[PDB]
């Protein structure tokens, strides 16, 4: 579930190096670059291509 419709949703994103899920919210979507801005619980931020990420809602 990607695209502009994901904005506003709380998701957990898989970081392979830590073998961990980290919780955040999708704050925006860049249509041209197909990028989501994820703001994490712990203050981290990532600009992500979610289609090549392991991640899940909830």
């Amino acid at each position: 579930a990607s695209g502009e419709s994901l904005v506003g949703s709380r998701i957990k994103v898989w970081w392979p190096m830590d073998q961990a899920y980290y919780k955040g919210v999708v704050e925006s979507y860049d249509a041209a670059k197909k990028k989501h801005l994820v703001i994490y619980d712990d203050g981290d931020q990532e600009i992500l291509y979610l289609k090549n990420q392991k991640w899940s809602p909830l």
């Binding site: 970081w15 392979p16 190096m17 830590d18 961990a20 980290y22 712990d42 981290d44």
Partner: peptide
Amino acid sequence: ARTKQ
């Protein structure tokens, strides 16, 4: 790298 630690 993409790690918290």
